[PDB]
Subunit: 369 residues, 2 copies
C-alpha cells in the first residue's frame, strides 16, 4: 500500500494516499489489542439493556451515520449515532439514566471542546457509563481524559492519521474501519479488510496524479451526493469535503435517492452536479437505479454521475465510474471506496480554483452552575 | 376562535398557513373525544418494557420525528426514535428489529404515498409483534383504511382542512406534529395547554399583517441557512425545504445546529447568505445558540443574520432579530410551531416575489420477496 508521491505538495493529498496502508496498520493494532478489548467489552455487551452511542463532531459525526444501523442490525445490540454537538447542547434528550451506556467517542485531534464535554455529560447523566474513545492524537484532550479514568478504554489510531489537513481524510476512514473491526471482527478484520484496502489503492492508482479532477472540472455551482441508508452518511461527508475545501464557493448538498424526490430535487439546476453512490445490496440498488433513470431523464442537471460496482444499462448510459473489480462488498465496505472519489474530487476542486486545501469557537457551559 | 384573516395572495398555501392555530385546537379537542379509545389501544403496548416506537414519514413528514422523537423519548422514558419512510423502504433490515415489539407511527397527508404503505407492510413483514398508529389527513387513504381494517392498528384522522392542497405541506405537518405530542404527552401537551401555542402563533401571523413585507424581506440573498439546536434542527430542516420547494430551487437552502455549524458548514456563509437562528428557550441549550449568534454577528460576513427568540439579550439585539409575542415559557417542541410560522410565510412570499406560483411551484416500490 505504498503511496505514490503527492505531486500537489499538500498534506491533504498525502493523507488521502496513505489511507489503505493506515487502515491495515490500525486493524493489525486491533489484533494485538484483541484480548484487552474483549476483556473490556465482553462484560458490557452481555448487558441486555446496554445502549451504545457513537458520537463525534463534524466529519467525526458521520462515522456513526454510516455504520451505526449496520452495527445494530448485524449484532442485534442497541447501537445508535448522536453527534457530540447534540449531546453537548441537549444532553437530557439523548442520555438515559435508566440504562447502562457505552459511549464510543471519535476525535481526530481529541481537542474539540465538545468531545470531552460529551464524555463528562455522559458520566454526569448515566450512572453506569463506559467509554471507548477512538482517536488519532495521543496528546489530545479526549485520550488524555480517558487514560485518567477507570470506565474507559481508549484506542489510538496510527500516528499518520492525525491529519494535518483542515479537512479530515485518513482520520475518518481509519476510525470507521477500526470501529467496525472492534464490534464485527468476524466480518471486518485484518484479513477481509485487505480487500477493501486493495480496492481503494486501485481506485487511487486509477486516478493517477489526480490532475483530471476525478469528475472533471466545470462551472457547476451546486453539488449533490446521494446514497441510500448509511451511504447517505457517506454522501454527507462527501458534501462537507467539497464545501470545506472550496471555502463554500461550491454549494454542496446530500440526501438519499428516495428522500431526494420529496422536495430537495428542486435544487437541481443546469449548474448542478449530481453524484449517486449505488448500493451493492440488490434490493436497495433497485431504488438507486430507479432514481438514476429519473435524473438522467429529467435533463435538469449539468452532469449526473453514477458510481457502482456493477455496470448496468442505466449506470452505463451516461457519466459513470465502475469500481475496480473485487469480491462482493457490503455497503459499509463500499463507503470507503466512494469516499476515495469524493475526497480526491474536493482536493482538486480546491486546487483548480487556486485555494490552499490544507488551509482552505465553542464555549462549554456547565450543566451545574 | 382563531379565525384566519383573508388570504389576499389568493393561494391555497396562504389559506393553509393561516388556518393552523384553529386546526391545532380542532385536532386536540378531537383527541379528547377519542382519548379513552386511544388509551385502550396504547396503554397495553406502552406497558411493554422492550417496545420500540418509530416515527416515520417522507419529506416534510419525516421532519416531525426529527423535531419531537428525542423529547418524547426523554419525557416518557420510552424507546422513541425517528426513521424516514424513505429509509425504511430502501434499507428495512437496518431499522426494523424482529426481536422486539414495534409501534409504528406513520405520518402521511394523503395516506397514499407508495412509501407510506410500503413502510407499513415492511414493518409487518419484519417485526412479528407490530402495531400501527397512522396519523393522517385523508379518510379515504390507504394508511387510514388499512389501519381501521386491522386489529393491530389505530388510526387518527386530522381535521379536514389540513389535507393541504398546496404542494408544500403547512397545516398538515404542524397538525400531525401537535397531535402526536398530545397523544403521548397529554399531561404537557393538550387541548388546554396548547391553546397558548395556538394563541401565540395566531399573534405571530397577525403581526405579519397581509404578509406583503415578506417576513425577513426581499434582499437579493442567494443562500439561506436555518440553525436550531437539538430537535429544532428538524424545524430548521423543514424551514430550509420550504424555501427550496417554493422558490423552485432558486434560493439554495441549508440547515444545521448552531454547534454543528462550526465544524465545516460555516464555510457556506457568504455576503449573499441569510442566516436565521431559532434560539432555544431551554436555559442550558440557549447559551450555545447565543455564543454561535455572537460569532456570526462578529464575523459580519453574511448578508444578514436574524435571531428569532422569546427573550431579547444584548447578543440578540446587536443585529436583525424578531422577539416572539409575549407568552408563558414554552419548551422547544412548543417553540417549533412559532418558528415554523415565520419560515412558512417567508417561503411563500419569496416564491410570490420571484413570480412563481407557490401552490404549484416517481418512486417504484419493489417487493422484499424477489
Amino acid at each position: 500500500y505504498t503511496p505514490a508521491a503527492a505531486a500537489t505538495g499538500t498534506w491533504t493529498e498525502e493523507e488521502i494516499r496513505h489511507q489503505p496502508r493506515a487502515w491495515i496498520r490500525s486493524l493489525t493494532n486491533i489484533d494485538a489489542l484483541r484480548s484487552a478489548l474483549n476483556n473490556f467489552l465482553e462484560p458490557l455487551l452481555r448487558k441486555e439493556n446496554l445502549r451504545i452511542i457513537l458520537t463525534g463532531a463534524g466529519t467525526s459525526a458521520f462515522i456513526g451515520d454510516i455504520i451505526a444501523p449496520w452495527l445494530a442490525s448485524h449484532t442485534g445490540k442497541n447501537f445508535s449515532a448522536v453527534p457530540t454537538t447534540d449531546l453537548v447542547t441537549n444532553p437530557m434528550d439523548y442520555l438515559n439514566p435508566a440504562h447502562p451506556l457505552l459511549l464510543i467517542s471519535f476525535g481526530r485531534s481529541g481537542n474539540s471542546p465538545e468531545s470531552v464535554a460529551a464524555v463528562e455529560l455522559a458520566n454526569q447523566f448515566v450512572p453506569e457509563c463506559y467509554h471507548l474513545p477512538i482517536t488519532c492524537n495521543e496528546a489530545g484532550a479526549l485520550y488524555q481524559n480517558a487514560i485518567n479514568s477507570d470506565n474507559a478504554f481508549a484506542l489510538l489510531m496510527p500516528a499518520e492519521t492525525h491529519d494535518r489537513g483542515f479537512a479530515m481524510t485518513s482520520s475518518i476512514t481509519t476510525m470507521m474501519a477500526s470501529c467496525l473491526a472492534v464490534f464485527a471482527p468476524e466480518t471486518i478484520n485484518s484479513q477481509t479488510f485487505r480487500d477493501v484496502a486493495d480496492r481503494c489503492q486501485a481506485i487511487l492508482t486509477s486516478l493517477g496524479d489526480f490532475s483530471e479532477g476525478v469528475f472533471g472540472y466545470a462551472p457547476w455551482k451546486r453539488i449533490v451526493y446521494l446514497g441510500s441508508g448509511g451511504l447517505q452518511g457517506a454522501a454527507r461527508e462527501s458534501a462537507l469535503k467539497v464545501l470545506e475545501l472550496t471555502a463554500g464557493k461550491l454549494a454542496a448538498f446530500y440526501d438519499s435517492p428516495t428522500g431526494f424526490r420529496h422536495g430537495p430535487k428542486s435544487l437541481v439546476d443546469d449548474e448542478t452536479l449530481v453524484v449517486v453512490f449505488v448500493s451493492s445490496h440488490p434490493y436497495t440498488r433497485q431504488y438507486d437505479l430507479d432514481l438514476l433513470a429519473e435524473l438522467r431523464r429529467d435533463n435538469q442537471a449539468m452532469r449526473v454521475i453514477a458510481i457502482a460496482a456493477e455496470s448496468s444499462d442505466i449506470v452505463a448510459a451516461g457519466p459513470h465510474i465502475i469500481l475496480p473489480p473485487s469480491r462482493h462488498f457490503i455497503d459499509v465496505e463500499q463507503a470507503f471506496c466512494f469516499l476515495m472519489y469524493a475526497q480526491t474530487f474536493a482536493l482538486m476542486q480546491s486546487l483548480h480554483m487556486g485555494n490552499t486545501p490544507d488551509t482552505p469557537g465553542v464555549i462549554i457551559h456547565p450543566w451545574q452552575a
